[PDB]
Each structure stands twice: as structure tokens, then as C-alpha cells.
Symmetry: D2
């Protein structure tokens, strides 16, 4: 698990459950290629997106589908999604946790990057 996503809900004070997440990797032609996807569990965590072998050096985009989340709760939010774009593994393999804290008109994201 070199890539994990965690999502929290700042309105309910809870994990954000059943949040869809799509990961893209920039290809040689500079387009965004689909790389992995999944949804957060009851704990707000999404594990198993990729493997150490598959998660090579590259520019990755983690799209967290916040609008679908809020609308599934009957709330009309501001943003379409939260996007997190970063270069990964440029100094060799690392483990990445992308965390996001959601409100209807605001979000924050941080990364925790560790060396295994």
C-alpha cells in the first residue's frame, strides 16, 4: 500500500464514508491516464489502490469526488471535487497518505510521505 487516501467530514465530525476516488497518471503525451479508483470505507480510508511495482515515478492526480458525497447527503456543495496533483517516487519509492477534510464550501488536504 504505497498510496492511501483518507477523508474526513468536518460537518458531522466523522470519517467521510463511500467517497469515490479516481487516480490518474500523466502519460507521455501529457494527457491524464486512468490509473486506479475506489471508494472510502466506513473508516474513511481507501486502501489497495495500487502496488509498489505499478506505482512508478510520475505525476499523479488524486480526484476526490466531494460533490457526489455531499449530494448523496442532500447538500449542495460549492466544489466539483477536490484535486491533489503531485510528483511521486522521484527520489525512489515512498509511501503516500493523501488526507482531506471536507466542508460544503471548503476543504483542506495534506500529504504524509514516508520512506519504507
Amino acid at each position: 500500500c504505497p498510496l492511501m487516501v483518507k477523508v474526513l467530514d468536518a460537518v458531522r465530525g466523522s470519517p467521510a464514508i463511500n467517497v469515490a476516488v479516481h487516480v490518474f497518471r500523466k502519460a507521455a503525451d501529457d494527457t491524464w491516464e486512468p490509473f486506479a479508483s475506489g471508494k472510502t470505507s466506513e473508516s474513511g480510508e481507501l486502501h489497495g489502490l495500487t502496488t509498489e511495482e505499478e506505482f512508478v515515478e510520475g505525476i499523479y492526480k488524486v480526484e476526490i469526488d466531494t460533490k457526489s458525497y455531499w449530494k448523496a447527503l442532500g447538500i449542495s456543495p460549492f466544489h466539483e471535487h477536490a484535486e491533489v496533483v503531485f510528483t511521486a517516487n522521484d527520489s525512489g519509492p515512498r509511501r503516500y497518505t493523501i488526507a482531506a477534510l471536507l466542508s460544503p464550501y471548503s476543504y483542506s488536504t495534506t500529504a504524509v510521505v514516508t520512506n519504507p
Copy 2:
């Protein structure tokens, strides 16, 4: 003046209006002495709290009554209030903006310190 407070609402995407704010200065006996207070404006801002002459170096606490704000909107909040505790330092820039972004179970705060 040298101290402004700005409060935003992350749920509604708006200034947080009519929020009570209290500023305290730390006394020699380590207690918190009332210093200044007011309510945020329609723009979520509270100006005119103090003056350059009165705002000396020291430790200050800005207490924002977030609980009343959320209850007035019919929303159940986690915190009793938000508190921002910091040292005023003459070495650094002269004007302090303390900004707070409010959610029912979360808040963020930053300082914008300029000349």
C-alpha cells in the same frame, strides 16, 4: 488598527456575521485580562479593537464564540469556542490579521502579519 479579526463560514461559504469575539492579554500573574471585544460585521470582520499605543508586546488570546454562531443557525457544534493564542512582537511587521475558518467540528486559523 494593529489587530483585525476575520471569521468565515465553511458550511455556507460566507462571512461569519455577528460573531462575538473577545481579546485577552496575559497578565503578570498568568491570568487572562479582558483587553478588547466586539461582534463581526457583515463582512465577517472586526476592526477597531485596539490602537498602536495600547497594543504592546505580550501574549494575547482571541476567543471566538463559535458555539453561539452555530446554534443560531440550528447546527450542532463540537467546540465551546475557538481560541487563538499568540505573542505580539515589535520586531516583526506591524499589522496582525487573525483569520478563522469555521466548520461545525473543525476550524482553521492563520495569521497574516504585514507592514
Copy 3:
């Protein structure tokens, strides 16, 4: 105008000055079309991006070049940029402020939407 962008630096406690900002509008073929751009001022603000007439309902992306900002300060950042993607809606209030608070490995963004 109807759209302002404000960028703050959480490390130095200051406006984020001379940060490049690009605004895109989503086209019918789902691609991102350049719409407006500029660099933040000494106050961390970028005004005059668009007008009421040009800023129609639709999906917009605000891309903030955070990587260059941090590198110019000699600090190693995590993100390639910060992106804020949202729908402009005529039903809601008329003026949009997109604010971003920057750290090397984190950012926060909020929308202040007023009449």
C-alpha cells in the same frame, strides 16, 4: 469583478505575492479552455480577472502555481499546483472569492460567495 482570488502563505504568515493563477472554463467537449490569468498582488490578491458579462454559469477551474512559489523561497513542495474546481451558479450570490492557504505539503481553500 465577480471573481477574485486570494492566496496566503501559512509558513511565513503573509500574503502569497507574485503567484501565477490561471482560470479555465469547461468547454462542451469536456476540455479546459483558458479563460483568465494573472499574478497575485502585494496583498496576495488577484482582481480584474473577468466581468459580469463574461462570467456565465458553467464549471471553472482555478489553478494556482504553488510549486513555483515555494521553489522561489527555497522550499521543497509536494504539489504541482493547487486546483479549485467549482460551478458558477446565477441562483446564488453574485461575487465569488476563492481563497487558498498554502503550506509546503498542504493547502486549504474556501469560497466566500456574497451579494
Copy 4:
């Protein structure tokens, strides 16, 4: 473990390690009584502050000593500490995670409240 504190560093993209945390509870005379303290581990987490029996209804203040943290890293921060004040267990026993994300001139905090 009805009360856990987690602290992250937004400058380094890491857990905030060795952060001192002091918890107070408001007493009948309206003063802040020392309740528990500890420091964050290598994972940025502080476990074992209290027990279900001891963690009764009350108003609690969690003081995270952010200034000592930044200064131990040779950085002069703005805030003295981050304070989190909340009523706990007013609708019966809950589990609380208090999370904080730190920068030198800014911090954010959120709560995750679960029912065991």
C-alpha cells in the same frame, strides 16, 4: 482509549513527533484542572491519555504545545499553542479523536467522534 490526539506537520509532510499535549477539565469552581498529559509518538499519535471510567462528562481543553514543537526544530512560530475546547460525553460515552495539522503561522483542527 476514549480520547486520542493526532498531530501532522504541513511543512515536512510527516507526523508531528514529540509534541507535548496537556488536557484540562473544567472544575466546579470554573477553573481548569489538570486532567492528563503526554506526547505524540513516531506516528504523531498520542494514546492512553485516559480511561472510560475517568473520562466523565465535562468541558475539556486539549492544549497542543505547537510553539515548543516548532522551536525544537529551530523555527519561530506565531502561536503559543493550539487549544481545543469541547464538551464531552454529554449524550453518554463517546470516543474522540482530536486531529491537528500544523504550520508555523497556521493550524487546523478537527474532531472525529464515534459511538462505541
